[PDB]
Every structure is written in structure tokens, then in C-alpha cells.
């Protein structure tokens, strides 16, 4: 609540190299983990390159992804409060859907519950992986719009027509971590299948 | 624009009434009424987002 | 869609109303036919209110607005789709006054 | 159980006195000048008031089940209401979308019915339980996200 | 004296006194009972209610003219059996009110018949069994009084009056008014097309009347919907729809419909998916023959 130019805080974010950073805001908001994912950072990034790459080689670029969305969708609130969501494109519509999915399905962790109350790695990357594959799918068919339709047309298309993997992303959150890793993992490579077998028949029949 | 082609647009219909009573003299009247040989009363109007 | 008139002087309107179909914007079969004079015009613009503005007709038209009672539609200027309406003479020359769009065109 | 009763000198909280009381005392309950001026006698405004034990506080004996549910639902809804009502005034109100005429109205009937009692009001945890099921029940299940279905279908309908 | 009244059979032993004349306790016993209806606890009596049920075969025929007056007795008799919620109960209880509706549809004296509506419509309570029999009697009944209009033009007003909450109260359960919060709010819920297929069928007339104008309206509003459980009603009433005309599934496939069985085909929640698999599937039944 206080200003985070209070001295002990200034001395602290001099030496700490990460600094999880809550906001009050989230608080009210109800979201549990209430962590800002705009004054938090973590200067130990580079240094886990090793480990992400052996790991999984592409969840650095899927981070960055979900990190320019999340700054996208702050930067442009201003705007949409300002002036109003008509003048949102289809890339802003996505753009929003995205950031809703993010602020609902991964950053909010309940953790009263079996299947939130651990995260394992694999299953956040998934989840993640998954989000992203959405956003990229949906931006390839927006910047299609070919076919007398598409763009704009697409991305309500998507939502009337993929809504159903659409409120499966969300649900994927719930899938519990006990039931183990291969399990867990068998289900996400599924329904990473299905999310590309979507906006492929919605590429297939051109809008 | 439009308003300066407007009145103009009623003194050239007004020819065709003029030249409709010199050949045909009175209209068919009542639900036929005549004086019409093309323009069928059919439009098409959709709202467009032009500057948002 | 249409666009009834239901109203007006009627010379320019039955040589517009319909020539090979379309029921001349459903104003026979519908609303009223385009002849006035007959009754108050005022009539004219509450049917606009009523049919024009159930989207099946999209204008209406008045005559010179001297005796074409427009001052009931005056506040028809909002909502222009509705209720859009130019003055023609159509032997009765146009005369600017309170009508249906004939205030916020001028202005 | 002591209940210190705090003057906020300039009404702020970065004094020093309310500060560390923050600090120490694990709650904090708010009486808004704002509140006051639209002559509801129990001011309470429950945005800032908050109890760091209320979860421990609550429990199956305590009251019911849905209890914490409520509790977040409100917040979650009081929240959105005030920042929906900022977003009508800059814009404007005929602006304002379906969903926010229904938050700006879910604040109207909380803060008339909900927050207002009398002098010697005493209504037991339960009524009052059922009464916040109605403000809640005002918005539509979809709307509800925060709370689990399994409380909804317990207490949406009653 | 209740208790003194249901103790002395003496009552009904004068009502049993046929050798004396026809109505000469029954006279006397309806004129007594209408006098202690000004005293509700008199009415409601179960002495009072005990006659009532010995009394239902006499409720039926009136063919005498003697009858005809014992007939009006029994008609303040009513009257006063609406006057008090118990015995109200009792004639619930009491048998021969269908027997009572059709002597009244066969009423000579225009009175009698004008004093039976009247019972009719002070029977304003539901009372299921007799309000089925009057919706029997609503179509023929109500229908025949209405044309043998006579007596009182007060009376064939009231009769009127009465037709009409008839009518009103005629389904109610099964009223349009589910299908209007269902389809034409705009929130899905419990709606009579979706209960049985005629009534599907029904609601599709109004519905499509310029390219299904009303459905696709509600296609409209299935297509962009947040909550899957409005989402799945919508889609069951789509899929009835489509299942009621094969052309009509054509037409809804053409129309939103098509769209709102594409949202949520398969999402997490079963029933929004089960509903739109079932309207797509009725589409595509009616596509093709």
C-alpha cells in the first residue's frame, strides 16, 4: 500500500535480484497469488537459460510471447477505458481474449484446492504452451481474412465456432496434478492436437 | 451536393407527369395508378463503422 | 429494406412507387398509399414513427412542407435512418420549415 | 478479544499512528467520510475493511458452508461495480454497457439494503447469509465466476 | 352448538322425511344453513360439511320443477360453501361438481344457471380436479351460455367475466409464458417448445415468418453466449426446431443456429455440448432427406 520509495524498500531492490512484488489492487480483486506482473522481476532470467533449455527449448519464446501480450493488453486499458473497445480490431479482440485467459487460468491460483494447490513445471509450461498456441492460431487466421471474410469476421467466428476449446482452455486449469505427469502430460498434447485441428477446418472452410 | 441536385430533381420529374398526361392523358389510378416504368420500391441499407 | 412515403403530392411518388414489382416498398399491401391531401399528414409522420421505423421502410417523403403538417415529425431528426425525409416540389416547391429532417439538413 | 477504536487525524492512513497499528493489528475496519455524507449510520465501507483471521473465523459450525463464497463474491462485485461506475461517469452513462447498468445497480441495493441498519439492528449470521445469496442471485450465475457452482446450486435459488 | 348440531342426527332425520312432502326439512334445512353462513364457524362446521357429501346426489338433477327450487337451494347452498374456506374444502372433498356443471349447461330456469356461474366464479381457488372439468366446460359450457344468453344482463356479464379468468386460467402451467422468458428474453430457460415436439413445432410458426425472423433472432442470441447453461437451453430448443421441419433445419443451419451449435460443440461443460451436437445433428438430418 505504501510508496515503494520508502528507504528500506529502495535498499532491498538495490541488492534483491527478485522482487515478487503484490499488489493491493489484485487484493481487493480477490486474485490469491497477487502477484503484479508489471512492477515484479526476476534479474536471475538469464541465468536459467541452461536449465530452460535443456528442459523445454521452446517455453523462452512462449514466455516472451505471454510477457509482450500481458503489455500489450496493460498499455492499451488506458486506451479502451479511454475511448472504448469499438474501435478494437480483430488483433485487439484476440489481444484481450488472451489476457483474460492469462488473468483467469494461469497467474490465478486458488490453491485450496487438490488440483491448484501444487503446480507442477510441466503442467504450468503446458498450460502456457497451450495459451500461447491459442494467440498464434488465432493471429495466422485474423491475418488471413481472405475469402470475403476473416479479420474481424474470424475472430467472431472463432469465438462462435472454437468457443468450445475456448472454455476447455480454461477448464485445463482444473485437470488435476495427482493423477500424475504422464496422464496430465497426455492430456495437454491432446488437446495442443485439437487447438491445431481448430483453425485448421476454420482455415479449411475459409470463413 | 446532393441538396443543390435536389428541387432540380423535381422539375425534371415533373416533365415525365407532363409528358405522361399529353400521351396517356389520365394515370391508371387507384392500385395500378400508372407512370412507372422502371424503379421498383426495394433498397438495401447496412450500418458501416467508418472513423470508428 | 423500402422506403414508404404513405404521404405526399403523389405525381413524382405513383411514377416511383412500383413499375414491374417489390409492392412499391409494401405500400400498397402495407402502410398507406403514397397519395396525401386527403386526411392530415400528421398521420403521415406517426406512421413513420410506426412503419418506417419497423425497418421494412427505410425513408419517407413530404411536399414543400406548407401544408405536408410536418411539424409532428420535428423531433424525428434523431435517429436519421428511421426518419429521413427531403422536400421536393413535385408541383408543390419546396418550402423550408420544422419537418422531419428539413431543420437538421439545413443547419 | 479487544476492538480499538483508531482517529485517523487528517482522515489518511500514512500517519504514523494508523500506520503501525496496520502493522500490528491483524484487521482493519473503515468508517468513509463518504459513507457519512449519504447519512447511512453504520458508515462501514467493506472495500478497505479486511480481517487477516476471517477465514479461521468462519467455519461449518460458524456459518454456512457458502459463507467465504459470499464473502468474495461481494468483494469481487463491489470492486468491478465502483471501477464500472468510474468507467460510466468518464464516458458517460448512456455508454454504459448491460453488465455495468447491473454492477451500478448491485451497488445502489448494497449500499441501501446491505450496509444500512438500525440503531439496535441485531439479525443473526444465517438471514443475512441469505439476504447477501439475494444481492448475489441479482447477477446472473455466468456472472458469478468467483464463486463455485457447487455453493450456486446450494443457495442461488432458495 | 356445532357440536350440538353434528351430535343430533335429528337434522338429517327431518331431511329424510320424505312421506311428509318433497322439500319440507330440505327447505328448512338450506334456509337454515344460508342464515348460519353469516356465521363463518357455522358454515365451516363439519356438521355443516357432513351434510354436504350426504347432499352430492341431490346436487346433480334437478328435472322437477319442485326440483328446480330444491336446485336453487342447492345454489345458496354453494354460495355459502364458498362463503367459508372449510367448507370450500369439504366441496372439494364433495363429489357431483362435473355433474353439477353439466346440469347447470342444462339449465331451463336462467336463474339457476346465472346463480351456478356465480358459484363458478367465487370458486376463484384453483381446486384442480374442478377446474380441469370447467376447462371441459370452458369450450362447450361457457361457449353455449354465452350463445344462450338470457335473464339478467348483469347475470351475462358476470358469465362473461368468468369465461374470461376461465380462459385466462386455462394452461396455465402450460402458458406461453415459459417460451417467452426461454426464447424471446433472450436468457434461456425451461420453455414448452423443448418439452414436447408439437409444441416445438408450434413455437416455430410464430418464430419463422421472414426467413425464421423470431429464430433467428434467438440464433443471434445463442451464438454469443457467455454462459453455457443458457447456451445449452437455447441449443435443445434450436435442435427441436430443426427436428420439427427438415427445411427448417435447412433454414436454421443457414441462420445463426449453425453458429451457436458451433460454439461450445465440445467445451468442458457436457450439456452446452450435448445441446448443439443435437441441434448441428438436426440440421444436417433436415439438410438431407
Known amino acids: ?125 503446458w498450460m502456457m504452451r497451450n495459451i500461447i498456441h491459442f494467440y498464434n492460431l488465432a493471429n495466422q487466421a485474423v491475418e488471413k481474412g481472405a475469402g470475403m471474410d476473416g479479420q474481424k469476421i474470424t475472430y467472431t467466428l472463432i469465438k462462435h465456432r472454437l468457443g468450445d476449446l475456448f472454455y476447455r482452455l480454461v477448464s485445463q486449469k482444473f485437470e488435476d496434478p495427482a493423477e500424475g505427469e504422464p496422464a496430465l502430460v497426455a492430456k495437454f498434447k491432446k488437446l495442443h492436437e485439437d487447438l491445431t485441428a481448430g483453425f485448421r477446418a476454420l482455415e479449411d472452410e475459409t470463413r | 451536393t446532393t441538396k443543390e441536385s435536389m428541387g432540380e430533381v423535381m422539375k425534371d420529374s415533373s416533365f415525365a407527369l407532363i409528358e405522361a398526361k399529353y400521351v396517356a392523358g389520365e394515370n391508371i389510378k387507384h392500385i395500378v395508378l400508372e407512370n412507372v416504368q422502371n424503379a421498383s420500391i426495394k433498397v438495401r441499407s447496412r450500418q458501416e463503422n467508418i472513423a470508428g | 429494406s423500402a422506403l414508404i412515403a404513405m404521404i405526399a403530392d403523389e405525381d413524382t411518388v405513383t411514377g416511383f412507387l412500383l413499375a414491374g414489382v417489390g409492392n412499391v416498398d409494401l405500400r400498397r399491401k402495407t402502410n398507406y398509399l403514397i397519395v396525401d391531401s386527403k386526411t392530415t399528414v400528421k398521420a403521415i409522420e406517426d406512421a413513420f414513427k410506426e412503419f418506417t421505423t419497423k425497418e421494412d421502410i427505410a425513408i419517407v417523403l413530404i411536399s414543400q412542407y406548407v401544408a405536408n403538417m410536418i411539424r409532428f415529425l420535428v423531433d424525428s431528426y434523431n435517429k436519421p435512418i428511421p426518419a429521413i425525409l427531403e422536400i421536393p416540389s413535385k408541383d408543390h416547391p419546396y418550402d423550408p420549415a420544422h419537418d422531419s429532417v428539413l431543420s437538421r439538413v439545413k443547419n | ?76 462485485n463491489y470492486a468491478i461495480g465502483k471501477d464500472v461506475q468510474a468507467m460510466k461517469a468518464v464516458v458517460g452513462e448512456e455508454a454504459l454497457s448491460s453488465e455495468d447498468l447491473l454492477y451500478l445497480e448491485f451497488l445502489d441495493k448494497f449500499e ?25 442471485r441479482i447477477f446472473p450465475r455466468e456472472l458469478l465466476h468467483r464463486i463455485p457452482g457447487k455453493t450456486l446450486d446450494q443457495y442461488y435459488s432458495r | 352448538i356445532d357440536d350440538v348440531l353434528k351430535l343430533l342426527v335429528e337434522w338429517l332425520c327431518a331431511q329424510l322425511k320424505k312421506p311428509s312432502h318433497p322439500s319440507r326439512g ?38 322437477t320443477q319442485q326440483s328446480i327450487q330444491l336446485l336453487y337451494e342447492t345454489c345458496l347452498c354453494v354460495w355459502l360453501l364458498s362463503y367459508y374456506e372449510p367448507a370450500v374444502e369439504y366441496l372439494a372433498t364433495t363429489r357431483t361438481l362435473p355433474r353439477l356443471i353439466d346440469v347447470v349447461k342444462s339449465s331451463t330456469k336462467e336463474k339457476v344457471v346465472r346463480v351456478v356461474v356465480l358459484i363458478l366464479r367465487n370458486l376463484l381457488p384453483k381446486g384442480n380436479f374442478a377446474a380441469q372439468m ?40 402450460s402458458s406461453f409464458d415459459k417460451y417467452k422468458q426461454e426464447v424471446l428474453l433472450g436468457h434461456l430457460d425451461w420453455s414448452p417448445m423443448h418439452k414436447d415436439p408439437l409444441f416445438w413445432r408450434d413455437n416455430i410458426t410464430n418464430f419463422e415468418e421472414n426467413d425464421f425472423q423470431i429464430l433467428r433472432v434467438l ?16 441449443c435443445f430448443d434450436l435442435s427441436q426446431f430443426i427436428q420439427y421441419h427438415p427445411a427448417g433445419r435447412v433454414i436454421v443451419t443457414d441462420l445463426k443456429a449453425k453458429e451457436r451449435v458451433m460454439k461450445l460443440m465440445n467445451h468442458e461443460n457436457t450439456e452446452v455440448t450435448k445441446s448443439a451436437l443435437l441441434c448441428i445433428q438436426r440440421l444436417f438430418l433436415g439438410a438431407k432427406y
Open chain 5, 134 to 173: 370447467i376447462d371441459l366446460g370452458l369450450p362447450q359450457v361457457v361457449q353455449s351460455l354465452k350463445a344462450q344468453a338470457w335473464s339478467d344482463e348483469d347475470l351475462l356479464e358476470g358469465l362473461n367475466q368468468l369465461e374470461e379468468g376461465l380462459k385466462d386460467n386455462i394452461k396455465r402451467l
Open chain 1, 1 to 125: 500500500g505504501g510508496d515503494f520509495s520508502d528507504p528500506v524498500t529502495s535498499a532491498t531492490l538495490s541488492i534483491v535480484q527478485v522482487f515478487w512484488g503484490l499488489d493491493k489492487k489484485l487484493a481487493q480483486r480477490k486474485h490469491f497469488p497477487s502477484v503484479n506482473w508489471l512492477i515484479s522481476y526476476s534479474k536471475y532470467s538469464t541465468a536459467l537459460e541452461s536449465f530452460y533449455e535443456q528442459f523445454d527449448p521452446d517455453f523462452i519464446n512462449i514466455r516472451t510471447k505471454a510477457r509482450e501480450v500481458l503489455q500489450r493488453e496493460d498499455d492499451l486499458n488506458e486506451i479502451v477505458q479511454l475511448v472504448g473497445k469499438d474501435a478494437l480490431a480483430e488483433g485487439d479482440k484476440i489481444t484481450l481474449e488472451t489476457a483474460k485467459l492469462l488473468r483467469e487460468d494461469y497467474l490465478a491460483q486458488n490453491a485450496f484446492t487438490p488440483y491448484d494447490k501444487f503446480c507442477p513445471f510441466y503442467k504450468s509450461v
Open chain 4, 1 to 76: 478479544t479487544q476492538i480499538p477504536i483508531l482517529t485517523m487525524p487528517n482522515d489518511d492512513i500514512t500517519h504514523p499512528t494508523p500506520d503501525l497499528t496496520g502493522y500490528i493489528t491483524e484487521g482493519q475496519i473503515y468508517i468513509d467520510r463518504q459513507l457519512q455524507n449519504r447519512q447511512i449510520y453504520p458508515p462501514i465501507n467493506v472495500l478497505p475493511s479486511l480481517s487477516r483471521l476471517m477465514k479461521s473465523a468462519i467455519g461449518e459450525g460458524m456459518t454456512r458452508r457458502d459463507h467465504s463464497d459470499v464473502s468474495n463474491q461481494l468483494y469481487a
Open chain 5, 219 to 234: 440464433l443471434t442470441i445463442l451464438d454469443t453466449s457467455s454462459d453455457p447453461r443458457a447456451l445449452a437451453v437455447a
Open chain 4, 112 to 136: 441501501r439494503k446491505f450496509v444500512a441498519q438500525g440503531a439496535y439492528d441485531s439479525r443473526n449470521i444465517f438471514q443475512s447469509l441469505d439476504l447477501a445469496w439475494t444481492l448475489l
Open chain 5, 26 to 63: 330440505v327447505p328448512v334445512a338450506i334456509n337454515c344453513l344460508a342464515a348460519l353462513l353469516k356465521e363463518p364457524m357455522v358454515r365451516s362446521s363439519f356438521v355443516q360439511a357432513d351434510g354436504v357429501k350426504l347432499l352430492t346426489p341431490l346436487i346433480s338433477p334437478a328435472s
